[PDB]
Amino acid sequence: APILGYWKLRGLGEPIRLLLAHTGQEYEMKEYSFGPEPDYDKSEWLDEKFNLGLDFPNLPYYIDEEEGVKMTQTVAIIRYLARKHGLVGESDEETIKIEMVEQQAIELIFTCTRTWYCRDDDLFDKLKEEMMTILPGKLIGLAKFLGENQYIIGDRITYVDFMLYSILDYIRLFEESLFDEASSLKDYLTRIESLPEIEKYLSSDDFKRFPITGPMAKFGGS
Amino acid sequence: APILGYWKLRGLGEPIRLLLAHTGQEYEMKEYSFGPEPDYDKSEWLDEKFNLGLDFPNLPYYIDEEEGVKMTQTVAIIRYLARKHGLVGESDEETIKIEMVEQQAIELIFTCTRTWYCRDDDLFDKLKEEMMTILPGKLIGLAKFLGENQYIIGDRITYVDFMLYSILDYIRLFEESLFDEASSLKDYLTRIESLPEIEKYLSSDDFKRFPITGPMAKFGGS
Numbered sequence: 001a002p003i004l005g006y007w008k009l010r011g012l013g014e015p016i017r018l019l020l021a022h023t024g025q026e027y028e029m030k031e032y033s034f035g036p037e038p039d040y041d042k043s044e045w046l047d048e049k050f051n052l053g054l055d056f057p058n059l060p061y062y063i064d065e066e067e068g069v070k071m072t073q074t075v076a077i078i079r080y081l082a083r084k085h086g087l088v089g090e091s092d093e094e095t096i097k098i099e100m101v102e103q104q105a106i107e108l109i110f111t112c113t114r115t116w117y118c119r120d121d122d123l124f125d126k127l128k129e130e131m132m133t134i135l136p137g138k139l140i141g142l143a144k145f146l147g148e149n150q151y152i153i154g155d156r157i158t159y160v161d162f163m164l165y166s167i168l169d170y171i172r173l174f175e176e177s178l179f180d181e182a183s184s185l186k187d188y189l190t191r192i193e194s195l196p197e198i199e200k201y202l203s204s205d206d207f208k209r210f211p212i213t214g215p216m217a218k219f220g221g222s
Numbered sequence: 223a224p225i226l227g228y229w230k231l232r233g234l235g236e237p238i239r240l241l242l243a244h245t246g247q248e249y250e251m252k253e254y255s256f257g258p259e260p261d262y263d264k265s266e267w268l269d270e271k272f273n274l275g276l277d278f279p280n281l282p283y284y285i286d287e288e289e290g291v292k293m294t295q296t297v298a299i300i301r302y303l304a305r306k307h308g309l310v311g312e313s314d315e316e317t318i319k320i321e322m323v324e325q326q327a328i329e330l331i332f333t334c335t336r337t338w339y340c341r342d343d344d345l346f347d348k349l350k351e352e353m354m355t356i357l358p359g360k361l362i363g364l365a366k367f368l369g370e371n372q373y374i375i376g377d378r379i380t381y382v383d384f385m386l387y388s389i390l391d392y393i394r395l396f397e398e399s400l401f402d403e404a405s406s407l408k409d410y411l412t413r414i415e416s417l418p419e420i421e422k423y424l425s426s427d428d429f430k431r432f433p434i435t436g437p438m439a440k441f442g443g444s
């Protein structure tokens with residue numbers, strides 16, 4: 001039965017975990033923990049890193065010996081699973097919209113990570129204020145995109161709803177004020193949370209909202 | 223005829239331009255320039271930005287009134303075009319490989335940008351040494367991935383070969399020493415370059431190796 005490897009944190013793994021949950025697909029979850037203060041070494045990962053026959057050894061990874069699958073890119077992984085459970089577009093019109101939103105989600109992750117991982121206080125704060133001034137536009141764009149739709153593509157839930165859920169949730173837990181002029185999105189997150197297996201997943205003891213990022217990062221650390 | 227919008231740099235647009243070239247698809251290219259130093263305003267873009275009915279107005283964009291398409295995300299755009307010209311995987315095995323490489327290409331784009339755009343001299347230098355420590359592994363992974371194959375998948379060119387061409391070229395023009403022990407990849411670039419339409423594109427008077435990045439970037443400005 002298939003394996004999903006990633007850190008103890010939510011980070012890039014959550015949206016895959018979310019999709020596995022929704023589709024009720026059985027998986028074993030292999031987690032890696034960091035070292036203690038103030039090292040937090042990745043040695044537990046690095047010991048096994050190059051010895052799993054991964055083309056591009058990285059976290060997360062997904063391994064299905066049973067299906068002869070051994071992958072390592074978060075998007076690649078989620079698109080693979082999306083294909084298997086038909087959580088992809090049924091038309092190129094759909095596909096275009098899905099993939100725009102996909103990339104839109106990733107772009108947020110870039111901006112956020114670039115900031116949450118900067119350690120220089122004088123720099124962290126600088127980027128934080130720069131983020132505050134940029135994201136509102138981003139969130140409005142998504143609000144406009146979604147509009148009266150239930151999910152990103154309308155009525156049907158696609159893998160991008162999982163992607164989007166997490167990055168928006170992370171932003172929510174970071175500065176809700178950014179959602180002040182984009183309420184529609186909060187409703188959307190709730191809509192997702194109300195989903196049966198996502199509600200189970202989120203109400204599990206295994207679920208904790210923190211941490212989002214590594215203990216090394218300023219935000220979402222502990 | 224369809225329109226491709228982007229800045230007057232290679233940046234994220236080139237791999238799409240490359241693919242359009244190879245497939246001999248007719249397109250009009252709409253280009254945007256920044257303000258002079260030390261300003262670089264985006265006003266030329268911002269004038270037209272919200273007037274094209276783009277869901278996520280951003281550069282690059284692709285518009286084909288003929289087809290009813292108006293997209294804005296680089297990967298989304300290239301995957302759309304890949305689908306139209308069948309430069310995509312024809313098996314899940316193929317697809318999986320393509321999409322891992324795709325993400326691997328983007329991951330380089332990230333690692334390179336955070337460095338080439340960092341104005342802080344001290345920080346720039348730090349990130350540069352960090353790159354020089356990290357990229358070798360990256361390039362070995364790709365070397366191993368490609369092996370004796372002609373193109374990433376085999377004898378068949380996929381859109382990822384274009385993606386990869388550009389980011390590898392950018393890295394080459396940054397530090398050839400990184401490819402000192404990487405003949406396999408150098409051979410790969412040569413192969414892509416020696417495709418007829420790509421040779422035509424690269425030998426055009428419209429083609430200059432620089433600029434790669436924006437004026438504001440430390441590396442690749444013009």
Ligand SMILES: N[C@@H](CCC(=O)N[C@@H](CS)C(=O)NCC(=O)O)C(=O)O
Pocket residue numbers: 007011012042058059060113114115117118213214336
């Ligand atoms: N600090 C980097 C990215 C940091 C990052 O996301 N890496 C962490 C959290 S997933 C990690 O533990 N990387 C090890 C791995 O997953 O290979 C940046 O912002 O440029």
